[PDB]
């Protein structure tokens, strides 16, 4: 059931912004690890005396990496005279965020029809304002409300190239890496209490509802903006990974980003080639029994060769009543056991493909448990 | 003239420690960019609840990358019960350093015969103590004094593998990258006033003395520990890069690290291959006239082919009365126009090769000026 109750017109995920201590080194690591091209910058070389911001792109996926300069470079400026390209940026907020949480997502940005209306309607419906709507070069409007923890939901709307004040990067610096990643599929938050988090976010957006944790997914009208939220389940034998996250992150925050690949086998071949030379590591592969048991579960979707390819790369597979899900998880992206990345490809639900086709892989919890147990053998 | 006036026995450069906001992403970027292997770690997986520290090595060169965890993970500990592997580490000092200076070198570490004696003698001769000598697992002694700005000179001595509490890394994670870099040749500081900086450092070590700036080099007895220091020259047409450094760094600090290569042509081929895919960029190449003029200056040292190889890679060449110097500079390593890296190879002064053979390239200032002028043509 989809009531289509969005309180304002939402289009697609637009970008994800990481707050960093040094944007250069994080961006370069991510570019090589994920096969994303450098495509825009806003920094000293573009007149920005406030923050260094570098944009990576792969297909429609946009990762922004931002770090503060010394406040002294901009101590003469005031907000009317600011050289910052992202007016919501604040030196103190950024340093407080990174010292508290370490490297992580500050903003989940969605493109909307009218960012000022989205902000006003959100706040009228309980959203905690973070940064009021600001019109950038009479062309782009940006506004921010609190989502969970110190993560904001960022609204962006365009009258008619990332943001004003960002320059496209020189093609010499812009090497066309591409491992097949094409768009953000979902962005997941960890909170202490799921109920109040859902009530808050669904309250101001109108988004509808789509071991160790309880979870639920909020979705926009066409279910292309997908925001799962997790809470820990206390008192289990194995301590909840959600609780470990909250402890190491100093509270609620973004847990994982799911990136859709147009060819998950190629993406994982390419990423795994680079794991030990600057890229990303992957969680331990499931035991061979998991792949033995995949014939009975998805034998009608993937051939024996395609499932063998999954076993090589450590891919996981799940299936709902509508489609099939291929997925795999990186180790944490930084020092702390907090944020990680999921690579995903979905099969089925063709009308274009409908959002969330195949679910989010919750069947893989019991199947992995069963798998290791019967693997022990 | 070399008075050999060291006030304590100094061996070689031991390691350079960067203070980071996220050690993982910086270390992985540096590993790929410079061809250095991951060889030791101290972090949550080794029982360290205080800081994440990752060691990269290439030949004898050791780069350490350290970032703080949430203080809450170790809030129950006291210094006697600390899980930190580097006892001088302090959460507050580290966060203050990175917010003030951004990514940069916290410690220039030299190996000495007796770190406690070096500390005591240094402090008796004017050194400002930073961290008193601590004996680690009855095996290694570590102590720190202020060098300049918030950079410390770190003494390490071994009774008889990096530091106790560091684990060698699993060979799967340890990919044997190597672009030919073999050791640290010199480490350079920028200060506001050269005179008082020299008087201070030469005062407590006994080290002897070996446009836009004035500079001087302090050296140990065998001139294998080499510490150049720069000050800005004010009032020139083109603003001093030393002054720009001081402004963007919020004061004195480490300007560049010079890394000796056993084959600078191979190192630069390998690094330049990776510039646009996660590695390091290099400063703009000198004009062809510079390479035209190299026949008259070093035609007896490098063949026409070897000088052509220099022109391809943008290498610079200088020469004193004792040897020849091949050098090239990266763009800044991080967001701010502060720290960069020099790659170097020295030819001549064979006895082993004596330290500083060929100087530090100060002849390249006037030669580059002349070169661009006569290039304009
Ligand atoms: C480690 C692991 C496995 Cl074994 C399987 C799926 C995912 C995953 O991506 C999740 C989401 O996107 C979501 O909404 N989830 C809820 C349970 C519905 C899961 C947590 C993860 Cl992290
Ligand atoms: C941009 C540039 C050029 Cl054009 C040539 C050499 C170096 C260099 O490495 C320096 C040192 O190591 C040192 O002691 N130096 C003093 C002058 C004696 C220079 C600055 C640099 Cl940065
Ligand atoms: Co997911
Ligand atoms: Co130098």
Coordinates of C-alpha atoms in Angstrom, one line a residue, chain A:
Chain A
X1 CA 0.0 0.0 0.0
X2 CA 1.4 3.4 -1.1
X3 CA -0.7 6.3 0.1
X4 CA 1.5 8.8 -1.8
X5 CA 1.4 11.3 1.0
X6 CA 4.5 13.4 0.3
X7 CA 3.9 16.9 1.6
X8 CA 6.0 18.4 -1.2
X9 CA 7.2 17.3 -4.6
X10 CA 10.4 15.2 -4.3
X11 CA 12.4 14.1 -7.3
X12 CA 15.6 12.0 -6.7
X13 CA 18.6 11.7 -4.4
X14 CA 20.9 14.6 -5.5
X15 CA 24.1 14.2 -3.5
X16 CA 25.7 13.0 -0.3
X17 CA 28.1 15.3 1.5
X18 CA 30.8 14.0 3.8
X19 CA 32.4 16.4 6.4
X20 CA 36.1 15.7 6.6
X21 CA 39.2 17.1 8.2
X22 CA 41.1 17.0 4.9
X23 CA 38.8 16.8 1.9
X24 CA 41.6 16.2 -0.6
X25 CA 42.8 12.9 0.8
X26 CA 39.3 11.4 1.4
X27 CA 38.2 12.4 -2.0
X28 CA 41.2 10.9 -3.7
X29 CA 40.9 7.6 -1.7
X30 CA 37.2 7.4 -2.6
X31 CA 37.8 8.2 -6.2
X32 CA 40.2 5.4 -6.7
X33 CA 38.4 2.9 -4.5
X34 CA 34.9 3.4 -6.0
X35 CA 35.8 4.5 -9.6
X36 CA 34.4 8.0 -9.4
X37 CA 35.5 10.9 -11.4
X38 CA 36.5 14.3 -10.1
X39 CA 34.0 16.7 -11.6
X40 CA 33.6 19.9 -9.7
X41 CA 35.5 21.9 -7.0
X42 CA 35.0 24.9 -4.8
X43 CA 38.2 25.9 -2.9
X44 CA 40.9 28.5 -2.7
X45 CA 41.5 28.2 -6.4
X46 CA 37.9 29.2 -7.0
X47 CA 37.8 32.1 -4.5
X48 CA 36.3 30.1 -1.6
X49 CA 38.2 31.2 1.5
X50 CA 35.9 29.3 3.8
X51 CA 35.8 25.6 2.9
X52 CA 37.4 23.1 0.5
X53 CA 34.7 21.1 -1.4
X54 CA 35.4 18.4 -4.0
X55 CA 32.7 16.6 -6.0
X56 CA 33.0 13.0 -7.3
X57 CA 30.5 11.5 -9.7
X58 CA 29.7 8.1 -11.1
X59 CA 26.7 8.0 -13.3
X60 CA 24.1 9.9 -11.3
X61 CA 25.8 9.3 -8.0
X62 CA 27.3 12.5 -6.5
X63 CA 29.7 12.4 -3.5
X64 CA 30.8 15.8 -2.0
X65 CA 33.8 16.0 0.4
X66 CA 34.1 19.2 2.4
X67 CA 36.6 20.4 5.0
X68 CA 37.1 23.8 6.7
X69 CA 40.0 26.1 6.1
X70 CA 41.5 28.2 8.9
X71 CA 38.8 30.6 10.0
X72 CA 41.5 33.4 9.7
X73 CA 41.3 33.3 5.9
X74 CA 37.7 34.5 6.1
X75 CA 37.7 36.4 9.4
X76 CA 36.8 39.7 7.6
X77 CA 33.8 38.2 5.9
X78 CA 30.2 38.3 7.1
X79 CA 27.4 36.2 5.8
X80 CA 26.3 38.8 3.2
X81 CA 30.0 39.0 2.0
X82 CA 30.8 35.3 2.3
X83 CA 33.0 33.5 -0.2
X84 CA 31.6 30.1 0.8
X85 CA 29.8 28.3 -2.0
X86 CA 27.6 26.3 0.5
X87 CA 26.0 29.0 2.7
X88 CA 25.0 26.5 5.3
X89 CA 28.6 25.7 6.1
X90 CA 29.9 26.7 9.5
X91 CA 33.5 26.3 10.6
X92 CA 32.5 25.5 14.2
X93 CA 29.7 23.1 13.2
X94 CA 32.0 21.2 10.9
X95 CA 34.9 20.9 13.4
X96 CA 32.5 19.8 16.1
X97 CA 30.9 17.2 13.8
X98 CA 34.2 15.6 12.8
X99 CA 35.7 15.7 16.3
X100 CA 32.5 14.1 17.6
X101 CA 31.7 11.5 14.9
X102 CA 34.8 11.2 12.8
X103 CA 34.5 11.0 9.0
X104 CA 30.9 10.7 8.0
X105 CA 27.9 12.0 6.1
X106 CA 26.7 15.5 7.1
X107 CA 24.0 15.9 4.4
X108 CA 21.6 13.6 2.6
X109 CA 20.5 15.9 -0.3
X110 CA 17.4 15.3 -2.3
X111 CA 16.3 17.4 -5.3
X112 CA 12.8 18.9 -5.0
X113 CA 10.6 21.1 -7.0
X114 CA 10.8 24.1 -4.6
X115 CA 13.3 24.0 -1.8
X116 CA 11.8 27.0 -0.1
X117 CA 8.3 25.4 0.0
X118 CA 9.8 22.0 1.1
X119 CA 11.6 23.8 4.0
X120 CA 8.5 25.8 5.0
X121 CA 6.1 22.8 4.8
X122 CA 8.6 20.6 6.6
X123 CA 9.1 23.1 9.5
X124 CA 5.3 23.7 9.7
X125 CA 5.0 19.9 10.1
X126 CA 7.6 19.5 12.9
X127 CA 11.0 19.6 11.1
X128 CA 13.8 21.2 13.1
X129 CA 15.3 23.9 10.9
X130 CA 19.0 23.7 10.3
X131 CA 19.7 26.3 7.6
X132 CA 17.0 28.5 6.0
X133 CA 16.4 28.6 2.3
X134 CA 19.0 30.6 0.4
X135 CA 18.9 31.4 -3.3
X136 CA 22.3 30.9 -5.0
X137 CA 23.0 33.2 -8.0
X138 CA 19.2 33.4 -8.6
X139 CA 19.5 29.9 -10.0
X140 CA 19.5 27.3 -7.2
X141 CA 17.8 27.2 -3.8
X142 CA 19.2 25.2 -0.8
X143 CA 17.7 24.6 2.6
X144 CA 18.4 22.1 5.4
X145 CA 16.4 20.5 8.2
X146 CA 17.6 18.0 10.9
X147 CA 17.2 14.3 9.9
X148 CA 18.8 12.4 12.8
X149 CA 21.8 13.0 15.0
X150 CA 23.9 15.7 13.3
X151 CA 22.8 14.6 9.8
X152 CA 20.7 17.0 7.8
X153 CA 18.2 16.4 5.0
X154 CA 19.2 19.0 2.4
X155 CA 16.6 20.3 -0.1
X156 CA 18.0 21.5 -3.5
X157 CA 15.8 23.0 -6.3
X158 CA 16.8 24.5 -9.6
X159 CA 14.9 27.1 -11.6
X160 CA 16.2 25.6 -14.9
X161 CA 26.6 22.8 -13.0
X162 CA 26.5 21.3 -9.5
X163 CA 26.1 24.5 -7.5
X164 CA 26.9 28.1 -8.3
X165 CA 30.5 28.9 -7.4
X166 CA 31.7 25.3 -8.2
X167 CA 34.0 25.0 -11.2
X168 CA 34.2 22.0 -13.5
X169 CA 37.6 20.4 -13.1
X170 CA 40.4 20.5 -15.6
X171 CA 40.3 17.4 -17.8
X172 CA 43.9 16.6 -17.0
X173 CA 42.9 16.2 -13.3
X174 CA 39.6 14.5 -14.3
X175 CA 40.5 10.9 -15.1
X176 CA 37.4 8.9 -16.4
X177 CA 37.3 6.1 -13.8
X178 CA 34.1 4.1 -13.8
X179 CA 33.5 0.7 -12.2
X180 CA 29.8 0.7 -13.0
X181 CA 28.2 2.5 -10.1
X182 CA 25.3 4.6 -11.3
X183 CA 23.1 6.0 -8.5
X184 CA 22.3 6.1 -4.8
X185 CA 19.7 3.5 -4.0
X186 CA 19.1 4.2 -0.3
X187 CA 20.7 5.9 2.7
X188 CA 20.4 4.3 6.2
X189 CA 20.4 5.8 9.6
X190 CA 21.1 4.3 13.0
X191 CA 19.2 5.8 16.0
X192 CA 18.7 4.9 19.6
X193 CA 14.9 4.8 19.3
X194 CA 13.2 3.9 16.0
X195 CA 9.7 4.9 16.9
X196 CA 10.3 8.6 17.6
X197 CA 12.7 8.8 14.6
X198 CA 10.1 7.5 12.2
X199 CA 7.4 9.7 13.7
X200 CA 9.6 12.8 13.2
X201 CA 10.8 12.2 9.7
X202 CA 7.5 10.8 8.3
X203 CA 5.8 13.7 10.2
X204 CA 7.5 16.5 8.2
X205 CA 8.0 14.7 4.9
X206 CA 4.9 12.7 4.4
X207 CA 7.1 9.8 3.4
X208 CA 5.3 6.5 3.9
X209 CA 6.4 3.1 5.3
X210 CA 7.8 0.9 2.6
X211 CA 19.6 -10.1 14.6
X212 CA 20.3 -7.2 16.8
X213 CA 18.1 -4.5 15.2
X214 CA 14.6 -3.4 14.4
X215 CA 14.2 -1.4 11.1
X216 CA 11.8 0.4 8.9
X217 CA 12.0 2.2 5.6
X218 CA 10.5 5.6 4.7
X219 CA 9.8 6.2 1.0
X220 CA 8.7 9.1 -1.2
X221 CA 5.7 8.9 -3.6
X222 CA 7.4 7.0 -6.4
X223 CA 9.6 5.2 -3.8
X224 CA 12.9 6.3 -5.4
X225 CA 14.0 8.2 -2.2
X226 CA 14.4 5.4 0.3
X227 CA 15.5 6.1 3.9
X228 CA 15.8 3.0 6.1
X229 CA 16.3 3.6 9.8
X230 CA 17.6 1.1 12.4
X231 CA 17.5 0.9 16.2
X232 CA 19.4 -1.6 18.4
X233 CA 17.9 -4.7 20.0
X234 CA 19.4 -4.9 23.5
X235 CA 20.1 -8.0 25.6
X236 CA 21.2 -10.4 22.9
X237 CA 24.0 -12.9 23.2
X238 CA 26.0 -11.0 20.5
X239 CA 26.0 -7.3 21.2
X240 CA 24.1 -5.3 18.6
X241 CA 26.2 -3.7 15.8
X242 CA 23.7 -0.8 16.0
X243 CA 24.7 -0.2 19.6
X244 CA 28.4 -0.4 18.7
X245 CA 27.8 2.1 16.0
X246 CA 26.0 4.5 18.4
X247 CA 28.9 4.2 20.9
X248 CA 31.7 4.8 18.4
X249 CA 29.9 7.5 16.5
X250 CA 28.8 9.4 19.6
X251 CA 25.2 8.9 18.8
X252 CA 22.8 8.7 15.9
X253 CA 24.1 9.1 12.4
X254 CA 24.2 7.7 8.9
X255 CA 25.1 4.0 8.9
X256 CA 25.4 3.0 5.3
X257 CA 25.0 4.2 1.7
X258 CA 23.7 1.7 -0.9
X259 CA 25.1 2.4 -4.4
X260 CA 23.3 0.8 -7.3
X261 CA 25.6 -0.8 -10.0
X262 CA 24.6 -1.5 -13.6
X263 CA 26.9 -4.6 -13.3
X264 CA 27.7 -5.7 -9.8
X265 CA 30.1 -8.4 -10.9
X266 CA 32.2 -5.8 -12.8
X267 CA 32.0 -3.3 -9.9
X268 CA 33.2 -5.9 -7.4
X269 CA 36.0 -7.2 -9.6
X270 CA 37.2 -3.6 -10.0
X271 CA 36.8 -2.7 -6.3
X272 CA 38.4 -5.9 -5.0
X273 CA 41.4 -5.4 -7.3
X274 CA 42.1 -2.2 -5.5
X275 CA 41.3 -3.2 -1.9
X276 CA 44.9 -3.5 -0.8
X277 CA 46.2 -0.6 -3.0
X278 CA 44.2 2.3 -1.6
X279 CA 40.6 1.3 -2.1
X280 CA 38.0 -0.4 0.0
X281 CA 37.9 -3.7 1.9
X282 CA 34.8 -6.0 1.9
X283 CA 33.2 -7.9 4.8
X284 CA 34.2 -11.5 5.1
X285 CA 32.6 -13.7 2.5
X286 CA 29.8 -16.1 3.4
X287 CA 30.8 -19.8 3.5
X288 CA 30.4 -22.1 0.5
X289 CA 27.2 -23.6 1.9
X290 CA 25.5 -20.2 1.4
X291 CA 26.3 -20.5 -2.3
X292 CA 25.3 -24.2 -2.2
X293 CA 21.9 -23.1 -0.9
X294 CA 21.5 -20.4 -3.5
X295 CA 20.3 -22.9 -6.2
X296 CA 17.1 -23.6 -4.3
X297 CA 16.5 -19.9 -3.6
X298 CA 17.3 -18.1 -6.8
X299 CA 18.0 -20.9 -9.3
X300 CA 15.4 -19.5 -11.6
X301 CA 17.0 -16.0 -11.7
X302 CA 20.7 -16.6 -12.0
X303 CA 22.4 -19.3 -14.0
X304 CA 25.0 -21.7 -12.4
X305 CA 27.7 -19.6 -13.9
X306 CA 26.2 -16.3 -12.6
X307 CA 26.0 -17.8 -9.1
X308 CA 29.5 -19.1 -9.3
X309 CA 30.5 -15.5 -10.1
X310 CA 28.7 -14.4 -6.9
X311 CA 30.7 -16.9 -4.9
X312 CA 34.0 -15.7 -6.3
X313 CA 33.2 -12.1 -5.3
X314 CA 31.4 -12.8 -2.0
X315 CA 28.1 -11.4 -3.2
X316 CA 24.9 -11.9 -1.2
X317 CA 21.5 -12.6 -2.8
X318 CA 18.0 -12.0 -1.4
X319 CA 14.6 -12.1 -2.9
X320 CA 11.1 -10.8 -2.0
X321 CA 7.9 -11.6 -3.8
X322 CA 8.5 -9.0 -6.5
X323 CA 12.3 -9.1 -7.4
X324 CA 15.8 -10.2 -6.6
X325 CA 18.6 -8.4 -4.8
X326 CA 22.3 -8.8 -5.2
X327 CA 24.3 -7.0 -2.4
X328 CA 27.7 -6.8 -0.6
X329 CA 29.1 -4.6 2.1
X330 CA 32.4 -2.9 2.6
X331 CA 34.3 -2.7 5.8
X332 CA 34.0 0.7 7.5
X333 CA 35.1 3.6 5.3
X334 CA 37.3 5.2 8.0
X335 CA 38.9 4.7 11.4
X336 CA 35.7 4.1 13.3
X337 CA 33.3 1.0 13.0
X338 CA 30.6 3.3 11.9
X339 CA 29.7 4.2 8.2
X340 CA 30.2 1.6 5.5
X341 CA 29.0 1.2 1.9
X342 CA 26.7 -1.3 0.2
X343 CA 26.9 -2.2 -3.4
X344 CA 23.6 -3.4 -4.9
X345 CA 22.0 -4.5 -8.1
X346 CA 18.2 -5.2 -8.4
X347 CA 16.5 -7.6 -10.8
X348 CA 12.8 -7.5 -11.7
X349 CA 9.9 -5.1 -11.2
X350 CA 10.0 -3.7 -14.7
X351 CA 7.2 -1.5 -15.7
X352 CA 11.9 1.6 -15.9
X353 CA 12.4 -0.4 -12.6
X354 CA 10.3 0.4 -9.6
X355 CA 12.1 1.4 -6.4
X356 CA 13.2 -1.0 -3.8
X357 CA 12.7 -4.0 -6.1
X358 CA 13.7 -7.1 -4.0
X359 CA 13.7 -5.4 -0.7
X360 CA 16.8 -4.6 1.4
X361 CA 18.1 -8.0 2.2
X362 CA 16.6 -8.8 5.6
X363 CA 16.3 -12.4 4.5
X364 CA 20.1 -12.6 4.5
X365 CA 20.2 -12.5 8.3
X366 CA 18.6 -15.9 8.9
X367 CA 20.1 -17.4 5.7
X368 CA 23.6 -16.4 6.9
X369 CA 23.0 -17.8 10.3
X370 CA 21.6 -21.0 8.8
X371 CA 24.5 -21.1 6.4
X372 CA 27.4 -20.9 8.9
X373 CA 25.6 -23.4 11.1
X374 CA 25.2 -26.0 8.3
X375 CA 28.7 -25.1 7.1
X376 CA 30.2 -26.1 10.4
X377 CA 28.9 -29.5 9.5

